[PDB]
Design a protein around this nucleic acid. Sequence first.
DNA 1: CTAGGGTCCTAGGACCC
DNA 2: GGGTCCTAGGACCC
Length: 342
Amino acid sequence: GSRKIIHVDMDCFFAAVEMRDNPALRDIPIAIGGSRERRGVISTANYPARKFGVRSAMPTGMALKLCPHLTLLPGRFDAYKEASNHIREIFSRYTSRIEPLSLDEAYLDVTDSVHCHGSATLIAQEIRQTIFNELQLTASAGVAPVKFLAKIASDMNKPNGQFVITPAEVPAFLQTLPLAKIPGVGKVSAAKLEAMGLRTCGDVQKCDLVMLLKRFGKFGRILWERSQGIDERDVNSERLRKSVGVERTMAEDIHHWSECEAIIERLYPELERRLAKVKPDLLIARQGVKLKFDDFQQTTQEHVWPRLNKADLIATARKTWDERRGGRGVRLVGLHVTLLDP
DNA sequence: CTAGGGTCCTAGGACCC
DNA sequence: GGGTCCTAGGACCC
Ligand SMILES: Cc1cn([C@H]2C[C@H](O)[C@@H](COP(=O)(O)OP(=O)(O)OP(=O)(O)O)O2)c(=O)[nH]c1=O
Ligand SMILES: [Mg+2]
Ligand SMILES: [Mg+2]
């Protein structure tokens, strides 16, 4: 009863799209991200920029200190969505069992596939080659019996490569696998695990599930399972979007309600346009606002509401401004909607 | 020097039975 | 004295 799971993941996605569409950028360091003057961060960088240490989520000021010649690009999201739709269509030539996780990646369950004599290795290779042939972008892939191992494997031979983990190989692979490599084990969890002597899956294997449950709750069961190669999560294919948000960080902090209200007036039309694409009648479950202060604390306040309404979002932002700000400057204003459940 | 797009989990009181 | 809704926060993912 062993499944075959592929994880396909585009290489340096946004940057690879920009280098294809403008070959002038192929061999200089580039990154998509907000300017230093906009208090931006890097969305991603090409390999010439990564060589200097430039990474996703890095503050753009730090990126530019590491790489003074970095070319900063704003981003063309319709171009990325176009490439995304294309690779998902390519995935569909092989199976309907597709769970996209983001624009540039997806799980595929090819257990019941007849392509390539049932070879998940050869299916992954064909998909990667077809994506290069049709989009002139490269992808990496991982092949494993369960989701999380397939996703880890897709990183091990990138760019433009793949890695296969068989059941026979799972114990040796897990023994030294750092817990931080597990999707969902982030910096905070890894530091808590490290402070109790747990670094790798091999370490967690020597642990009592009951202690893990007590110390981490439901997350402790996940850690226990994953550390043994256990991951029964099915490839879904029917997941739907549950929210839409629109937020902006200002170049300077704001200190006056008039400035906040002015920012909302620009955010609202964008929220309405994006909601309408998926809910033409604007009917929703909740709406709300987000403020982020200069001490980086953030607050949200949202409430049951039947239909997108600008004045109520202003009114709510006014309350939040008056009630939870405590005289701090504000660096971000955001609007938010929770979608009806079907 | 710290984005913008999201998902998921936790947790207290409200409301219900 | 349990189940679910409402709400806020926060880790985490891309
Ligand atoms: C991680 C990350 C990605 N993104 C965007 C830009 C990425 O190109 C796109 C897909 O993310 P990833 O697949 O995580 O990264 P990548 O494609 O740029 O590089 P890699 O070859 O290592 O896979 O999502 C962000 O905007 N912010 C982020 O923090
Ligand atoms: Mg990628
Ligand atoms: Mg990806």
